[PDB]
Design a protein around this ligand. Structure first.
Ligand SMILES: [Mg+2]
Ligand SMILES: [Mg+2]
Ligand SMILES: [Mg+2]
Ligand SMILES: [Mg+2]
Ligand SMILES: [Mg+2]
Ligand SMILES: [Mg+2]
Ligand SMILES: [Mg+2]
Ligand SMILES: [Mg+2]
Ligand SMILES: [Mg+2]
Ligand SMILES: [Mg+2]
Ligand SMILES: [Mg+2]
Ligand SMILES: [Mg+2]
Ligand SMILES: [Mg+2]
Ligand SMILES: [Mg+2]
Ligand SMILES: [Mg+2]
Ligand SMILES: [Mg+2]
Ligand SMILES: [Mg+2]
Ligand SMILES: [Mg+2]
Ligand SMILES: [Mg+2]
Ligand SMILES: [Mg+2]
Ligand SMILES: [Mg+2]
Ligand SMILES: [Mg+2]
Ligand SMILES: [Mg+2]
Ligand SMILES: [Mg+2]
Ligand SMILES: [Mg+2]
Ligand SMILES: [Mg+2]
Ligand SMILES: [Mg+2]
Ligand SMILES: [Mg+2]
Ligand SMILES: [Mg+2]
Ligand SMILES: [Mg+2]
Ligand SMILES: [Mg+2]
Ligand SMILES: [Mg+2]
Ligand SMILES: [Mg+2]
Ligand SMILES: [Mg+2]
Ligand SMILES: [Mg+2]
Ligand SMILES: [Mg+2]
Ligand SMILES: [Mg+2]
Ligand SMILES: [Mg+2]
Lengths: 72, 104, 55, 134, 174
RNA sequence: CACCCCCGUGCCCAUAGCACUGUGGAACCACCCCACCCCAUGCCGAACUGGGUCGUGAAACACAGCAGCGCCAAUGAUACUCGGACCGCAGGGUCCCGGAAAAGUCGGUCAGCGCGGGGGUU
RNA sequence: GACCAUGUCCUGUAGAGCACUCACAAGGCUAAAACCUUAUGAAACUCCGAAGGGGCACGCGUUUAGUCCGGGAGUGAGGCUGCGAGAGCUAACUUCCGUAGCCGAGAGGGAAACAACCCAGACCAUCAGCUAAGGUCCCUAAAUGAUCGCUCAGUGGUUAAGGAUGUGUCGUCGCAUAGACAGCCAGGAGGUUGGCUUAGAAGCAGCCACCCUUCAAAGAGUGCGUAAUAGCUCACUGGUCGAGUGACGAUGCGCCGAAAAUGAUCGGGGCUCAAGUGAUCUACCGAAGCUAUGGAUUCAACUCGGAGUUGUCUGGUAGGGGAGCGUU
């Protein structure tokens, strides 16, 4: 063994209560650990970036049912 | 099962586009076909077939579409999204769309 | 509230060091009056083991 | 005591027991006083001796079990390369976790059974009788 | 008897078997007990009976011990739970099992194991619950198991466990 | 939101779900009804689908009862831990202050809020 | 800026649980996978799940740092301790990471001695004062201090499994002025030289099983005995006897366990007629920390055309900057 692979510094890049420019990246994820609410659009590797400038808010009933909206 | 309708009604993510959606219920030919702004829990333009008659269901459906087109144009609406139900765009409902956008 | 340093800041984790510094006693044997505001009351609870709280 | 198939290696730590602080099954029993690993062989010696005291008996539950491999490095080698391969299995035994639990044998007989069964053990232990059990 | 100790008061080295709440729909109550004097009663009653307490204020309150929270490191009690008795078959209590006499397998066979030393049942009588359950094991043969289904249940008691579950069972030697 | 009830479509996002079950009937919905063709089945009008009344509330669905199940769930007590301060050679553990679960008991629920329409008391 | 408080969001550790995966404990059920009652472990298991922790916003509050831009660097070998892990043997003044602090770069008091530990960051001067850690019998500064005990071991002043009628403090179980525990005399029984055994096994090698008579009174019955019985004792019985005893337990301080190499020791003397100890309370000693008087620099405000006042600062390796002294 003695093998390993680079860190992928994934996360909630922008936490609810953070104003965001358009195109800011807010969550990094392997998949849909977050499912993108209103105003946000999710990319190829399933990072989801805000489309509209404003505050970031978490809709989060959880269990795969967590969504990131942006409010203007 | 009828995973046609939850699928087609998750594909109206473009209610985020601002257009209203136009539900239809090719059931008993009751084809009531409401128009809805989803943001409020509100519907804006009913067209139930209570006593419209008009004959066979495929043409009574177009009658429902042509009547609802006026019923919604009165209030000031023009953007449209045809949220079909489980039903195909097979004709008896397709007439509803033809007659509806014939006179928006 | 009355406050007096009676413990060195040396050898104590640096949050306690910037805590005493913003409290504004730079040497043991200093004292000061303090506001009742929860911010500074918690600023003093954080390093109460360094100080003699009087009131 | 040996585990029939696994994943290969482990690690270690301790804090007080959360599984099996109360006795069931038996009449009396025995409890640890000290955190520790216990090898397969320490179990088997307690079984051998308490089966010596329980001829034609059959009242010997063993409510513990070597789950954890522990792997000494080979002969004389400088450090470098893996944890060799496993040398023996051990069971974590935190205090208050029962090990042993007899039935069907009179108090002084079970008491002597537990004397010998503890003396082969690497820990303090205590015999208990059951009554504050939900 | 018990005194009030609401919130988190300190205890005497006389254990005062603290951390005791009695509850139903009505009211929650205070902790403080009288240490060994608790144990001297509990072993006699042992979940299958009730006894009144008299904190200052409430001169009486019946409860039947729901559960105990003993220390693990030093086999001693700590916290005890209680439930009030609203009477009129409301009681869901765990009766101890007991076995009578010589069995036919205790004659020539071997072991006589109680697989369920206690078993839960509802009691039609609230203030009258069995203190035990003597079982007539005399007539079983070696390798047979008395199932719960034929366990005597005096005075209209229901059985809160599986009819087919084994309770006692004779076992072969070795 | 005059009172109920039906078809639909939302918010909610198992305290709303399951099962047992009873009411429902041409008002609504639902099966049955026929198929060369619109249209379709990698075989079947079962599914879409097109042409309709009888018939029937069977099944499905709606709505009530329902605490067997699931779902939630205290208080209390712990586990643990932020800071402080200690003991044991060691594994390990204690104390002061404050935060504090999980499991279980007690107990809670077979929901709760809209919007448009259809037919009722005529 | 920084700490701290509020608000909010994100996390899958400790713990805890088996609901999936691997494992695994006693049974019931059965062509055993499966299934149920009961029972458990898990770095690569999670129905759950703190404490904390990070980002934002505010400052609803104390503070003084920050940011960028340009010149010069050095450093890129770390060391310990505590907490959390890995590797190791739950070895190492071991090796590798996280984290806090010290050391490096650190003087001063304590720890006999001692980079790391505990106290405390040295501008200068004083034959001034209060204290920290640590101390107060003599060395050696300062109570042979006070009060309730604890240990008679030099424990103190080197471990453990394990043992012990050692001793205090509680605490659970029995049998007693219808008179018990040792303690003296008195009896020891009945089929029965009891079934089951090897060659004989007969309280008394030993696998299987313990009921029944005669009795105020005795278990086919304890350790011994030659290979077997006797034999002196025992568990109940008794005149006497005259009042407490015996058992497992929690613990506080101690005993044993406990052998290495030039000569011993707690730093030494010596300490129980406390100089050990656990609990309390003072009174003082005790530092280059703090306070007093004097004094000078770094900075910054404040005044006059570096000066002076007030505050403040001044441990220091590589290094950067600044003012100056000496020689031709
Ligand atoms: Mg850990
Ligand atoms: Mg458990
Ligand atoms: Mg390897
Ligand atoms: Mg609580
Ligand atoms: Mg605190
Ligand atoms: Mg801590
Ligand atoms: Mg706490
Ligand atoms: Mg700030
Ligand atoms: Mg864990
Ligand atoms: Mg972290
Ligand atoms: Mg602002
Ligand atoms: Mg530069
Ligand atoms: Mg290097
Ligand atoms: Mg390092
Ligand atoms: Mg290892
Ligand atoms: Mg090293
Ligand atoms: Mg090295
Ligand atoms: Mg160096
Ligand atoms: Mg330093
Ligand atoms: Mg020093
Ligand atoms: Mg030393
Ligand atoms: Mg010295
Ligand atoms: Mg040196
Ligand atoms: Mg030095
Ligand atoms: Mg050193
Ligand atoms: Mg200290
Ligand atoms: Mg002094
Ligand atoms: Mg002092
Ligand atoms: Mg002196
Ligand atoms: Mg010992
Ligand atoms: Mg004295
Ligand atoms: Mg003084
Ligand atoms: Mg001084
Ligand atoms: Mg000075
Ligand atoms: Mg001067
Ligand atoms: Mg300096
Ligand atoms: Mg200085
Ligand atoms: Mg200097």
């Amino acid at each position: 063994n003695g093998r390993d692979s680079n860190p992928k510094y994934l996360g909630v890049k922008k936490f609810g209560g953070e104003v965001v420019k358009a195109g800011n990246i807010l969550v990094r994820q392997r998949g849909t650990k977050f499912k993108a609410g209103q105003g946000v659009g999710m990319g190829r590797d399933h990072t989801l970036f805000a489309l509209s400038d404003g505050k970031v808010v978490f809709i989060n009933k959880g269990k795969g049912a967590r969504f990131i909206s942006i409010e203007a | 099962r009828r995973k046609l309708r939850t699928r087609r009604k998750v594909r109206t993510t473009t209610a985020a586009s601002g257009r209203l959606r136009l539900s239809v219920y090719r059931s008993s030919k009751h084809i009531y076909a409401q128009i809805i702004d989803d943001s409020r829990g509100q519907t804006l333009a009913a067209a139930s077939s209570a006593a419209l008659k008009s004959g066979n269901k495929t043409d009574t459906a177009a009658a429902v579409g042509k009547a609802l087109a006026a019923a919604a144009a009165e209030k000031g609406i023009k953007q449209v999204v045809f949220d079909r139900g489980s039903y195909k765009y097979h004709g008896r409902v397709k007439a509803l769309a033809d007659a509806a956008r014939e006179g928006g | 509230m009355k406050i007096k340093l009676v413990r060195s800041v040396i050898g104590r984790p640096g949050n306690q060091v910037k805590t005493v510094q913003a409290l504004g006693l730079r040497k043991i044997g200093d004292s000061r009056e303090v506001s009742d505001t929860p911010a500074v009351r918690g600023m003093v609870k954080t390093v109460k083991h360094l100080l003699e709280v009087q009131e | 005591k040996r585990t029939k198939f696994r994943k290969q290696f482990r690690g270690r730590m301790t804090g007080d027991a959360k599984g099996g602080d109360y006795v069931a099954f038996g009449d009396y029993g025995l409890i640890a006083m000290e955190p520790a690993w216990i090898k397969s062989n320490q179990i088997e010696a307690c079984r051998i001796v308490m089966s010596r005291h329980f001829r034609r008996g059959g009242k010997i539950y063993i409510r513990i079990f070597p789950d954890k491999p522990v792997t000494k490095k080979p002969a004389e080698t400088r450090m470098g390369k893996g944890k060799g391969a496993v040398e023996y299995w051990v069971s974590v035994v935190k205090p208050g976790r029962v090990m042993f639990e007899v039935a069907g044998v009179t108090e002084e007989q079970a008491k002597e059974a537990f004397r010998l069964a503890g003396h082969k053990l690497p820990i303090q232990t205590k015999m208990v009788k059951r009554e504050v059990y939900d | 008897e018990l005194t009030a100790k609401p919130r988190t008061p300190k205890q005497k080295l006389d254990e005062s078997m603290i951390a005791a709440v009695a509850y139903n729909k009505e009211n929650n109550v205070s902790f403080a007990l009288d240490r060994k004097a608790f144990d001297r009663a509990f072993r006699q009653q042992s979940t299958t009976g009730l006894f009144d307490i008299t904190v200052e204020g409430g001169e009486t309150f019946p409860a039947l011990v729901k559960a105990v929270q003993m220390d693990k490191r030093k086999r001693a009690p700590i916290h005890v739970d209680f439930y009030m008795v609203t009477y009129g078959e409301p009681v869901e209590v765990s009766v101890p099992v007991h076995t009578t006499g010589r069995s036919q397998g205790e004659v020539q066979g071997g072991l006589v194991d109680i697989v369920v030393h206690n078993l839960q049942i509802v009691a039609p009588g609230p203030r009258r619950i069995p203190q035990e359950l003597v079982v007539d094991v005399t007539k079983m043969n070696i390798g047979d198991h008395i199932t719960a289904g034929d366990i005597k249940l005096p005075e209209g008691c229901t059985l809160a466990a599986d009819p087919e579950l084994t309770v006692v069972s004779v076992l072969p030697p070795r």
